[PDB]
Amino acid sequence: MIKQRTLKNIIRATGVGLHSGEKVYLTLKPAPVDTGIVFSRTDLDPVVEIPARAENVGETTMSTTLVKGDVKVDTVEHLLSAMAGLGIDNAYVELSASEVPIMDGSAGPFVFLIQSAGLQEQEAAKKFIRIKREVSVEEGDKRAVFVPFDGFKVSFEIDFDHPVFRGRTQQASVDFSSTSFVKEVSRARTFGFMRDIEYLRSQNLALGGSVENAIVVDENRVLNEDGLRYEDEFVKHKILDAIGDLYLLGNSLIGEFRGFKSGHALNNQLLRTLIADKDAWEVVTFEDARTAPISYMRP
Numbered sequence: 001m002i003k004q005r006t007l008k009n010i011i012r013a014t015g016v017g018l019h020s021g022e023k024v025y026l027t028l029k030p031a032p033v034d035t036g037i038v039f040s041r042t043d044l045d046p047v048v049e050i051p052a053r054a055e056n057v058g059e060t061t062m063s064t065t066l067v068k069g070d071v072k073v074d075t076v077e078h079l080l081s082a083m084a085g086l087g088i089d090n091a092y093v094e095l096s097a098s099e100v101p102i103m104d105g106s107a108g109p110f111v112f113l114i115q116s117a118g119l120q121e122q123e124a125a126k127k128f129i130r131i132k133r134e135v136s137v138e139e140g141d142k143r144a145v146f147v148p149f150d151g152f153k154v155s156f157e158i159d160f161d162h163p164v165f166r167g168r169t170q171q172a173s174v175d176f177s178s179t180s181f182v183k184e185v186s187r188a189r190t191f192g193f194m195r196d197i198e199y200l201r202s203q204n205l206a207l208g209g210s211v212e213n214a215i216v217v218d219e220n221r222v223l224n225e226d227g228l229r230y231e232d233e234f235v236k237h238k239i240l241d242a243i244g245d246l247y248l249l250g251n252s253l254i255g256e257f258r259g260f261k262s263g264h265a266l267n268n269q270l271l272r273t274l275i276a277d278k279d280a281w282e283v284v285t286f287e288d289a290r291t292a293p294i295s296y297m298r299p
Ligand SMILES: C[C@@](CCN1Cc2cc(C#Cc3ccc(CN4CCOCC4)cc3)cn2C1=O)(C(=O)NO)S(C)(=O)=O
Pocket: 018, 062, 063, 064, 077, 078, 190, 191, 192, 197, 200, 201, 206, 207, 208, 209, 210, 211, 214, 216, 237, 238, 241, 263
């Protein structure tokens, strides 16, 4: 059978919150079967546990934030993207502060730390959410859609009227049958525009931000000196963001996501509509790895 996965070993990282600018210790630990991903604020008494689930999403301005009460865990999307892309079902994520560290602004540091520790298959059937019926949400020109698909595929289109964007670099489609999360998406860094970042800075937002954890784009160029990791890094990053947000379902998806200028807010509205639409999805398991439409790397 395809088995639930957790970590083989504890993983530890240090960094800074992109938005808060606070130093944060992150500790990933193994977790039992059917736990899901569960964030823990270890700086609080008592320690507050927030499942990484759609129902615990609060704020979706410039990040995906989980909330229990007024306890926040901010910027969960890049770490959850890493978790989803390596097929982790169960894990405790301990934070010493309200935000997940930004690291290099990608999921690469997280994928590397997790794969360093190794994955452990557990003696329970991995449960997948299969999309049975198309579900789409829209708000103005933004759109996000789940479509039935025998596999896991993510397509994303951005529309910036800007010298850096103008080309085929504005749409990408990744079929995880064909194409490695780790090699093609995981290293895609977050990005912002100089005028929007100056606005945020004026509001004492973006306190952890720099060219070391973000692609900074002005009116005409990428400001970062050392270049892009990918010709289409920007759209790849939005794909990374979508994978992380989608993982708030709590299970790997057998289905296709298509995003047009979608972000955390619309992704969350998509999850909420999917969840509500019980005819559009079913939970499945695979007795036999060989008949599954998804293959995950060896643990
Ligand atoms: C929502 C987004 C973007 C989210 N972002 C990307 C992002 C970058 C940023 C910044 C900054 C900054 C840069 C330079 C400086 C000058 N000094 C500062 C002091 O140290 C030396 C540099 C100060 C601040 C803030 N910021 C942010 O909110 C995402 O990826 N979600 O997961 S997306 C791509 O739109 O979907």
